[PDB]
Design a protein around this nucleic acid. Sequence first.
DNA 1: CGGCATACG
DNA 2: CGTAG
DNA 3: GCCG
Length: 324
Amino acid sequence: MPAYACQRPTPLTHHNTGLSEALEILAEAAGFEGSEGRLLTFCRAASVLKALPSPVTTLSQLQGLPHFGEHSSRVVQELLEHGVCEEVERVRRSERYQTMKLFTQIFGVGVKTADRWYREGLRTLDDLREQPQKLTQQQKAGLQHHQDLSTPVLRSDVDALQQVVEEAVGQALPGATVTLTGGFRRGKLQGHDVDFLITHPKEGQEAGLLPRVMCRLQDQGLILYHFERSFCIFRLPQPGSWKAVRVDLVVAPVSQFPFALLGWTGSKLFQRELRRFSRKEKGLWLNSHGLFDPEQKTFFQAASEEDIFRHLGLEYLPPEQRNA
DNA sequence: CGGCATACG
DNA sequence: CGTAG
DNA sequence: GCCG
Ligand SMILES: [Cl-]
Ligand code: NA
Ligand code: NA
């Protein structure tokens, strides 16, 4: 088992779902306390189990696996012996975990804001609604649309959304293209992360594109709430009605498109691990715009995601195997 | 021990 | 501060 | 929390 998640295939569904979910509770709780190192370890340990070819049934089987030390091994041991890990269950039940999860789920609210509200004594969405002057415009929209945004959308909804975006993009700049990214590109059948990546085959033509796309979607009445990244809430048709959905639109020049496609396809852990691998193992600096050699002071050209994996000396993984 | 990804709005 | 993957 |  290689130590970096970008060195191994990770499918969307696997053989250790309950074990990984428990470790991810501890990772999430560590984030709510600002403990980013512990979050990463628990995320990495969970991801290792997603990559295994069969269920872990005995503690012996964790020997030698990267990111399994005393704490993560104890969690697994308790789940294997008793079906439940007391520490995980204590987290799940706690007022702190439940409230931090509720508040950070709001679009416009991060850990730092949620923690401050928690320390002020706030606990429910209606608590927040009773002091809207304490809210940014972004948080107001997140709160108003929270219920709809809490329900995932289906791939069929995604395909309907992509056609409306393509219509606006075609008027904004004929020849521009729209690519579905995020979790749907990794094979999800449902999810919240509806993301599109927009480019044009002629380098430079995409300059100024995103405002023109946004204006056209607004004129169509599709934008409930809203440069090169736009974080939107869209109206999605439903039988007899509609619902709010979070949609991100991103523009990249074609030269950068493989790097943006790679970054926006995820998973989050996969990208962090890829960037860590690049820098620490290869001495190259990776982001969603390019890959820099700091000794030559040159950027790699890439025409495909395959090029980027080759640059980094990694076997290619298709999107469906990037579910770290 | 230091490090933990790296951007944009 | 928030957002993204 | 774990790795190097
Ligand atoms: Cl930590
Ligand atoms: Na949030
Ligand atoms: Na998104």
